[PDB]
Amino acid sequence: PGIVELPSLEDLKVQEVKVSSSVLKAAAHHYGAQCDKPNKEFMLCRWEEKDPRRCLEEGKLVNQCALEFFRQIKRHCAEPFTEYWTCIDYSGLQLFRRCRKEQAQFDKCVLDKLGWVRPDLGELSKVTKVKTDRPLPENPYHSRARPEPNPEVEGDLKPARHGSRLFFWTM
Amino acid sequence: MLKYIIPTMMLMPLTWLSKNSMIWINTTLHSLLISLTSLLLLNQFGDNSLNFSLTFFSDSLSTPLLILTMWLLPLMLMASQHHLSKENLARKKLFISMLILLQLFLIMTFTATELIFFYIMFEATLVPTLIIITRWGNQTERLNAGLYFLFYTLAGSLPLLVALIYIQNTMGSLNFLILQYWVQPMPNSWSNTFMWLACMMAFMVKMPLYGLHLWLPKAHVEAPIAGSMVLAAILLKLGGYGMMRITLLLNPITDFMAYPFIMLSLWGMIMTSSICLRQTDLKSLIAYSSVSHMALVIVAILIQTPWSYMGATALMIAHGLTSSMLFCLANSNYERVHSRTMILARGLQTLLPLMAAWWLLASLTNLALPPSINLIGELFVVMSTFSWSNITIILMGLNMVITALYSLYMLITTQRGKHTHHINNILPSFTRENALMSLHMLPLLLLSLNPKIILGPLY
Ligand SMILES: CCCCCCCCCCCCCCCCCC(=O)OC[C@H](COP(=O)([O-])OC[C@H](O)COP(=O)([O-])OC[C@H](COC(=O)CCCCCCCCCCCCCCCCC)OC(=O)CCCCCCCCCCCCCCCCC)OC(=O)CCCCCCCCCCCCCCCCC
Numbered sequence: 001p002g003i004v005e006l007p008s009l010e011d012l013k014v015q016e017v018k019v020s021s022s023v024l025k026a027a028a029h030h031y032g033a034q035c036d037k038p039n040k041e042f043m044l045c046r047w048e049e050k051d052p053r054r055c056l057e058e059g060k061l062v063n064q065c066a067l068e069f070f071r072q073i074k075r076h077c078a079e080p081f082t083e084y085w086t087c088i089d090y091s092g093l094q095l096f097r098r099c100r101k102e103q104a105q106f107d108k109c110v111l112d113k114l115g116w117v118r119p120d121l122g123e124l125s126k127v128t129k130v131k132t133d134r135p136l137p138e139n140p141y142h143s144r145a146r147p148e149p150n151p152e153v154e155g156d157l158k159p160a161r162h163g164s165r166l167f168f169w170t171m
Numbered sequence: 172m173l174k175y176i177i178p179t180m181m182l183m184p185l186t187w188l189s190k191n192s193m194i195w196i197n198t199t200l201h202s203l204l205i206s207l208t209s210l211l212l213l214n215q216f217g218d219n220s221l222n223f224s225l226t227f228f229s230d231s232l233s234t235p236l237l238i239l240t241m242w243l244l245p246l247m248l249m250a251s252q253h254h255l256s257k258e259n260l261a262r263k264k265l266f267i268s269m270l271i272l273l274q275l276f277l278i279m280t281f282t283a284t285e286l287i288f289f290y291i292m293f294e295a296t297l298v299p300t301l302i303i304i305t306r307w308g309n310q311t312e313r314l315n316a317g318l319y320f321l322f323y324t325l326a327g328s329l330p331l332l333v334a335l336i337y338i339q340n341t342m343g344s345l346n347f348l349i350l351q352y353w354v355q356p357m358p359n360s361w362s363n364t365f366m367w368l369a370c371m372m373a374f375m376v377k378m379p380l381y382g383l384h385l386w387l388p389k390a391h392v393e394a395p396i397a398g399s400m401v402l403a404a405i406l407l408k409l410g411g412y413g414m415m416r417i418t419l420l421l422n423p424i425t426d427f428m429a430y431p432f433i434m435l436s437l438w439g440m441i442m443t444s445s446i447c448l449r450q451t452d453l454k455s456l457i458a459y460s461s462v463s464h465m466a467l468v469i470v471a472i473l474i475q476t477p478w479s480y481m482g483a484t485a486l487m488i489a490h491g492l493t494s495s496m497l498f499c500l501a502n503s504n505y506e507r508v509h510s511r512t513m514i515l516a517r518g519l520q521t522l523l524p525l526m527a528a529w530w531l532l533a534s535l536t537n538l539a540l541p542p543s544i545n546l547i548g549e550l551f552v553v554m555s556t557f558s559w560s561n562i563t564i565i566l567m568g569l570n571m572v573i574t575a576l577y578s579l580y581m582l583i584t585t586q587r588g589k590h591t592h593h594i595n596n597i598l599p600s601f602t603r604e605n606a607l608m609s610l611h612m613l614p615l616l617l618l619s620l621n622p623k624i625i626l627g628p629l630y
């Protein structure tokens with residue numbers, strides 16, 4: 001068949017969020033609140049295109065806005081955040097429940113110096129609507145023309161011509 | 172034909188609702204009324220057959236076979252009511268029911284407009300015949316007589332079925348009235364060759380053909396008298412009737428594939444007549460004579476000329492009456508001496524003079540005495556086969572020698588000479604037996620006055 005078309009390596013280069021998983025998970029609720037819009041535009045493009053090659057620019061927007069989030073944490077509240085993700089990072093399952101006092105200090109410093117509310121129980125699991133300008137993918141499965149179906153049954157059902165016509169049976 | 176099928180079916184309540192002693196008289200009376208009704212089938216025309224419905228029609232071929240078939244039933248009821256005198260009343264009604272059922276299957280075998288209905292009735296006639304032979308026979312060898320009669324016939328006919336269904340897929344119809352007008356020439360190929368063999372070998376078995384005839388000396392001597400009458404009288408003529416219906420489809424392949432069957436029959440009518448010269452059994456002698464006579468009908472059908480078909484249908488009707496009379500005469504000896512040995516009871520013209528007159532007349536109609544329809548059929552077949560090949564008159568004429576030399580020897584052994592001294596239960600001839608002889612012979616002599624009703628669709 002045809003050639004598979006991959007993007008070039010310079011099309012994939014972007015400043016990655018080079019932090020560990022506990023740094024992410026410790027800031028995860030504030031990241032889900034503040035970085036809502038480009039993340040939801042990207043996941044919308046990712047489920048609608050069903051092709052990662054048509055979703056690279058929204059991924060670059062995600063990778064930019066996540067860095068903007070961690071910079072805005074770093075400008076103001078780097079030390080309560082650092083101590084909080086260190087406490088989260090200690091645990092093996094990375095429990096939130098073991099580290100509620102550093103969470104209280106981080107939430108208070110973030111709320112005071114940046115004006116961010118942590119999302120409550122239930123909110124980040126909501127299905128939200130997204131206002132994008134890109135068109136709807138008319139053929140995301142890259143399908144072709146379905147075959148024409150068989151002609152249906154129509155017309156009044158007339159009685160059988162001369163019975164059954166089985167060798168001699170006149171009915 | 173539904174004015175003959177319904178009275179024949181209504182003979183079943185007429186034999187199963189009767190008094191315990193009236194069942195022969197009631198069935199005899201109403202079967203004679205149906206036989207008198209059977210003359211309404213003689214509305215025949217020189218061009219168009221008498222075409223009743225989509226299911227049934229009757230030309231001038233099936234009409235004499237129908238008259239003979241509906242006439243045979245009272246004669247079988249008269250012949251069979253002596254050895255079934257000690258029989259259980261329920262088994263007696265069963266025997267009469269098998270005769271009635273076999274008559275029904277025969278009278279809607281000959282009238283089948285469509286050939287697979289012909290096949291179904293043509294192979295439905297085995298079952299009451301088989302039950303009659305194997306149940307109300309007399310000897311140990313009746314059981315084997317039910318096997319050779321059966322598994323020859325189906326060996327011919329279960330191919331025929333397939334071939335008939337091939338025509339149902341090819342022409343679209345097995346109607347004989349359609350297939351007169353949609354018939355196509357059957358060319359020379361191996362497919363059409365085995366088509367011909369499948370269309371013909373079933374009827375070759377039921378004629379019988381020489382070589383295939385081995386079921387018949389076993390099925391006639393082991394049946395009761397009504398069974399021997401229905402085999403020799405009618406059930407050998409299903410083969411000739413089916414051949415005359417089926418060789419319409421088989422042209423021009425009949426004109427080169429029917430050579431060995433003509434050879435088999437022209438030599439088998441010599442060989443079975445020679446066997447009749449040396450049979451120690453009287454009923455076997457009549458059986459081999461039946462093979463000898465039906466070989467002429469096989470030859471006359473396979474040469475397919477008009478004189479041959481007219482002689483073949485006249486010979487079929489004449490041989491039905493004559494062979495039925497000869498088996499009834501052998502029965503008239505067997506019910507007194509209790510042995511079928513031909514040399515046993517000799518000189519019976521001294522003891523039974525009127526019965527010796529009936530033996531004389533039946534043997535004269537066996538040897539084709541003119542102007543009987545025996546001689547008319549014999550003679551027309553000999554004319555057409557002289558037209559076929561000029562040498563065949565030898566094989567005809569030599570046969571007409573030997574056909575006399577067992578017709579009178581059977582007369583001279585059983586009726587002439589000194590009577591056997593150690594046999595003294597030779598009763599006088601019953602009025603039943605003489606009535607049976609006269610009901611066989613008097614139509615066979617009246618048809619000499621008017622043979623044109625038994626000369627087929629092309630008189
Ligand atoms: C105002 C409103 C009211 C009006 C009322 C009007 C009616 C009043 C009366 C009502 C009662 C019914 C009367 C009969 C109606 C007509 C049926 C008929 O005769 O069809 C002829 C039918 C076809 O002839 P036709 O000339 O083309 O048409 C005439 C009619 O117009 C046929 O017309 P059709 O085209 O419409 O016919 C349709 C088709 C036409 O037929 C065909 O297309 C041909 C193929 C049919 C099947 C063939 C199968 C062959 C292989 C198996 C053979 C088995 C053995 C045979 C029997 C042995 C004994 C059991 O038939 C069938 O499909 C049915 C199958 C056959 C059954 C017939 C009815 C029987 C009823 C009584 C049963 C009693 C036992 C009968 C024997 C049992 C076996 C049938 O003939 C045959 O098929 C041959 C067999 C004979 C038929 C049955 C005879 C019934 C009377 C028997 C009296 C004596 C009984 C003694 C005891 C039992 C026997 C031991």
Ligand SMILES: CCCCCCCCCCCCCCCCCC(=O)OC[C@H](COP(=O)([O-])OC[C@H](O)COP(=O)([O-])OC[C@H](COC(=O)CCCCCCCCCCCCCCCCC)OC(=O)CCCCCCCCCCCCCCCCC)OC(=O)CCCCCCCCCCCCCCCCC
Nearest residue numbers: 524525528529532535536540541542543613616617619620
């Ligand atoms: C539509 C109406 C038509 C009416 C006309 C009739 C048409 C033909 C019907 C049947 C004719 C023959 C019947 C008699 C023989 C069977 C009975 C018997 O044993 O008789 C002996 C017995 C006399 O003997 P008995 O002393 O009283 O006691 C017995 C003896 O002890 C012991 O017996 P035996 O030793 O004394 O007797 C043996 C002796 C032995 O003699 C012979 O066998 C010699 C005769 C045959 C060879 C020579 C002639 C060859 C052919 C030439 C002649 C025909 C063509 C002539 C025309 C010109 C040329 C073309 O046979 C005779 O005497 C019988 C003479 C007649 C024989 C006819 C030919 C049969 C031979 C085989 C077939 C041949 C081809 C077919 C012929 C068809 C003729 C139409 O006769 C009777 O008692 C007669 C009873 C009543 C018979 C009625 C027959 C007709 C029934 C039809 C009913 C429905 C229609 C109403 C008309 C009724 C008219 C009355």
